[PDB]
């Protein structure tokens, strides 16, 4: 009984459809793109050309929604990288000491992650992916949405797809504002924090022996310094490759050319380690760029009127600067928020509004982590009424910087700081008395004076071939 229509078959659309099929009789996923039969790039997910970190908070939710996914990713060559034990990270506060594992991330190409999630989701035959199809309008009215009107791209024919619940997961470029304006609803409040961040990415073929058990390497901006924020990230992916993404805010954007890429990885960021490591490897692709880095949130949950049977989730409701690595985990938390409301309220007057409010809560930690750190860069453009961003800046930063600095050299503080940043714990966890006592305990290890690489990791950067 009941039917759902999901707009967009990306990460959020697949996750939400796997969940919905356990509550409704049929799910139809509408997408304007064409989908490959294997782990390939596609036009509707251009961001798959750039490094994607799947933090443990999102990975555990993906695993709850689609059992076997984590093992299938690792089984296809994805890397499980412990945090902080498997990371070499020059934070705004200095090198992170590589304490024993507190959290983890999954490292692979976004194309492999998407294919793995999609192929497992679509094993449920009550979910159908309808590709190469445009979304024309929401059916119904401002009181209740009853499906969507679509157009087949190849035939040009239009048809109505009925639904008891419509979930818009069409991503950062979602036409939700247009779809909702055509229903007669008022425009939602738009909040943005735009640092002007530009990404530049190349793929590399690293030394054959490093192809496994190599750390995630990251060189971070100092968000407190009054200069453009620049970063460099080297992440292992499947089949012996490294994806390297460099970035910079307004005034420090990376260049677009292959020859300027390595120079930026050495000299454009605060420490040259990523540039030094790519000199061991072999480039495989020319530079790809992205400007899809604005933190943008649409406050659909605060609209004065909201239709029954309509929910918006994923990048269509809240999209983040990708340097923080939260978007896929925020989408996963949002699918769980909808699932919780479905289990409490089933499908009665109020489900959609309750879910929309719960989704706003679910994305809020990722929103704060990104915006609080982007708002200070020179030339940042903002539109917000969030008092966490507009008021009490001195106090807010005092708490943030104290935890961040102490986390580099204190295992208990790092465990708490890692749990929040991977979206494995909520923001309130940081005010637990044990966390703030450890903060006051202070450092337990010296600050590293050099990148904390292990000898056994650096040894695998060379082959030894030219030696008898
Ligand atoms: C450069 C970059 C790097 C990132 N790095 C990370 C990272 O390290 N970690 C992380 O967790 N997240 C990262 N993200 C964010 C992550 O890619 C997104 O949060 C995630 O893909 C959101 O999923 P979604 O389903 O909402 O949208 P998408 O995955 O973008 O999927 C949207 C789907 O809707 C379809 N669609 C779009 N418009 C329409 C339309 N008008 N009609 C019909 N169908 C439509 C598209 O074809 C697509 O299939 C990064 C993003 C970028 C841009
Ligand atoms: Cl992109």
From Swiss-Prot:
Matching InterPro entries: FAD-bd, FAD/NAD-bd_sf
For activity, the cofactor(s) needed are: FAD
Q: Which GO terms describe its molecular function?
A: FAD binding; monooxygenase activity
Enzyme Commission number(s): 1.14.13.-
Ordered alphabetically, the record's keywords are: Antibiotic biosynthesis, FAD, Flavoprotein, Monooxygenase, Oxidoreductase, Plasmid
Q: Which domain of life is it from?
A: Bacteria
Q: Pfam families, alphabetically?
A: FAD_binding_3
Deletion consequences: Deletion of this gene abolishes production both of lasalocid and of the minor cometabolite iso-lasalocid without leading to accumulation of an identifiable intermediate.
Query: What general EC class does the enzyme of this chain belong to?
Result: oxidoreductase
Q: Name one GO biological process term.
A: antibiotic biosynthetic process
Record's function text: May catalyze the stereoselective double epoxidation reaction leading to bisepoxyprelasalocid A, a bisepoxide intermediate in the biosynthesis of the polyether antibiotic lasalocid A.
Q: What is this protein called?
A: Putative epoxidase LasC
